[model samples]
Target: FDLYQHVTDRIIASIEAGTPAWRKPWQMPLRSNGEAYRGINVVMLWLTAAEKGYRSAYWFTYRQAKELGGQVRKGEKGSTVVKFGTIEREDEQTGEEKKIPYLKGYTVFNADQIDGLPEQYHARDLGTAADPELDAFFAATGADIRTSSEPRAYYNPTGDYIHMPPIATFHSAAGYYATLAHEATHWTGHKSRLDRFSRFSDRKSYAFEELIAEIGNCMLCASLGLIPDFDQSAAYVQSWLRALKDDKRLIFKAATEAQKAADLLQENAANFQR
Candidate 1:
């Protein structure tokens, strides 16, 4: 369903022609206020990519935040209601309390409010368990109700069940929810069905799988009212974006299977088995 060849060809050309420039501009300044505010060239490139829902751009932001020793915030840099999750707690005095803990992920808003996103944003919410089959998938995978309601969500694959990160909770919001969706995207490629087994067969395959997860994550994010930030100023992301978009079958293959992966997570958690 994804426009495979048309987009892949252009992307391959961009890669071959060094469209990210002779090299992705390195040395984007990391500000003390926990912002990489400088490097207009890099910022503009990322802005353009984010507008298009490019996965590599989002990944670049993810990795860079880690390197700079800063956590990815929800919504934007200074958002007060940045989507996140928290632990329910009891007050020592009144015995009533609730608090969302640590930041996990966020929407890299290029403009204001919520603008600039790809088509996948409007797609159906795949996280919900709509039928017995989906229910079985969740049982089999043990991944359900993890997104919560936050703007950012997180999913980590365990040997049996794919575990949700700290930010994943039913009580959160969109930002955290989408982050969980992203992780669920990776679970789609296990050896059992998608047979994208090759994705993790080797280094290239593993890289491809990472792309699948990121794209799936981005797609799920879009569906949940969040737009991915297209900030790939980092040197490493250039290689990944180029490699992923180079193959014509990549997005199409990933999309068809990603939906199935979502199904796996929505079904009965026990069905995932040992």
Candidate 2:
């Protein structure tokens, strides 16, 4: 099977494991310096680790592992992660330099899959600090957010407001912010905003929008130095997997829209500072 199918299967298995995989707190995969991986790589690595039950969030190439005086343990299979880059080349007909993007994939072993690594290389405990700076940045987006005793979080497009349960009820500070990020992404889909919609006119339209928000939340969380928590329900997961399997381009389209949603919020936040 292809990469999309492989990842989709793992996610489905995770969902079938009795808890919505997205509801469980997961660490964003990172390199040794603690910088989080980007885009689809984040999803790929996280799914691989979660499926395999790896405890550490840190990942390293074979050389990086050796450089740190570590070796992959026997029988430990490395996970695949992709690296993206742009190459400059001359066009054959026009003789003009053009940039072409390419993806280069390589295998990386989780810190838990290797031996002799320092304990510091392992995943860190979740921090509980409420980030006031992050809170102010979101508030700058001009999105009306109201917290109450409500058990669910959602964005009401008619009234243009975001609803959330009290922050204290969240499993972690990151979880609370991640949930807000998901709804805020949905807020961007209003007619006045990005107006995100699926080309297919059916129930898949709603499911597609949910996929956009979920991935968008992950991107925002990584940008803010928080682990991207999954905010989607199990039903949405099955729908997404089905949709993803039906069309390979769906994820790329969803991720692109997600980026647009995140960008809109970031630009507004910056403008609000001025």
Candidate 3:
């Protein structure tokens, strides 16, 4: 990857901050490693995005939202209150059309939960490069850029979704696509897709989602020819070490899955090519 898709001060600063533990360098295949790699870095990256006002489609699924009486309120972007359409029914005694509120109330999960994702952000089809500028941007960065924009939300493994902020110009295109590619890695777990639920059968269901996303993101970044955020903090690895308990095979399995996800994104890049 050229690694100079956007030679801006902000981009350089972020890259210089160094990679997190979740992002391994020598272990190119480790990018596909599962739970062993998911950790605080995932949360940190998401926290940064959240701090920047990124919206999550699963905002309604949080425990806080449930306690607040299903309100669509959150501190993120596009977190709109769901409106209820009118429902018509026959009134028994009045013999009139009765109107009722058909609101499903607020969602019960937040972006941090893996329950399910909203429809708007879900992948409807494989991409065919409608946005040429963005496509060129991704190609320059060396991301094996795929076109499928699958809408995915993680509840069991973690709660974080990639929300693209409005970009006024065609610049910084790779930045946007790389983040989207990372999220696509998570999309592989959809029931209609890889059906990864069986792998998370042990414990820490949502944690594994982070692992996959992290590994997948690394691969995507590398494919784009950029040195990914190589994080090595033991704090994040501790969770995997505790969960896997010295089991090396688990690492390989997750890596395989991450690779599979990356492969999917690479295969689907035709959607974004301009």
Candidate 4:
């Protein structure tokens, strides 16, 4: 079997699993010592355990497992994590030294693969995302979100789901939250909940939907204390009116639908939470 391809598949699967539940904003990935994994390893372990359906978040090496009086299942496999650091090399041309970054990978087995670990290592929450507030709120919204390397943020009306770039890849976590907020706004639209799309013909509807999602994003982000991306909204809103030939007239009633969507999302979250 090709180890590279196997690892790639696991990473991609985790990316498709979204930022909630097993990934970011969900369960925290831990090392054998019960301390949080503090590198790309965290995400590595995250998506790995998620894809492999590992029961516990705790992960460790084969040797460490034995050191802990634990034994790996005979012939069982392990997942991979990355090591990132820098190397300094003397520049022959300049006779100077510089720090060069490098990445390395290692394989680790989840606690589920071994026995004799501490009680706490085995103790785990079967459900819940990592981020206490943001994850909880987004989870409450009940919209489907997948984090990928797509380099674009969009919601599919047909699938009724949002797929976007990986959250950690964004400029900031704020951008991730804003993007999800914007996309989920679209989730509340279309023929389903808000029924906002049928109001406009195909040509005009696209621009109008974009309009609604952005406005709702502002409200949603502010509601969650995230500074909304106005320049992006302005940039797209400008494009919609110019390229899409929509209506400034739609803005008034459009505000109502945006407000309506926000209300629905808020209501859903509130009902789901204590």
Which portions of model 4 miss their true places by more than 4 Å? 1-130, 202-206, 234-249, 272-274
TM-scores of the candidates in the order shown: 0.38, 0.67, 0.39, 0.46
Tens-place lDDT per residue, model 1, 220-272, is 44333444323322344455565655566554454445445544544434454
Q: Point to the candidate with the largest lDDT.
A: 2
Q: Cα deviation in Å at residue 259, candidate 2? A: 6.0
RMSD to native for every prediction? 21.4, 5.3, 22.4, 17.3
Global Cα lDDT for candidate 4: 0.65
Best by TM-score: 2
Q: Scored by CA lDDT, what does every candidate get?
A: 0.42, 0.74, 0.43, 0.65
For TM-score, candidate 1 versus 3, the one ahead is 3
Q: Model 4: per-residue lDDT, tens digit, 1-274?
A: 4433444344334434533212222245677777666423443565667657887878889998999989899888987765557999889899699998875667789989997877777812212223467778888888887777888988888888889887667757766776778888888876878777676555633466766666566556545766555545434544444432333324334445666777789899888444
Q: What shift in Å separates residue 9 of candidate 3 from its native position after superposition? A: 37
lDDT accuracy of residue 98 in candidate 4: 94
- State residue 112's C-alpha deviation in candidate 4, in Å: 61
**CA lDDT, candidate 1, residue 94:** 89
Error of 3 at 3 (Å): 34
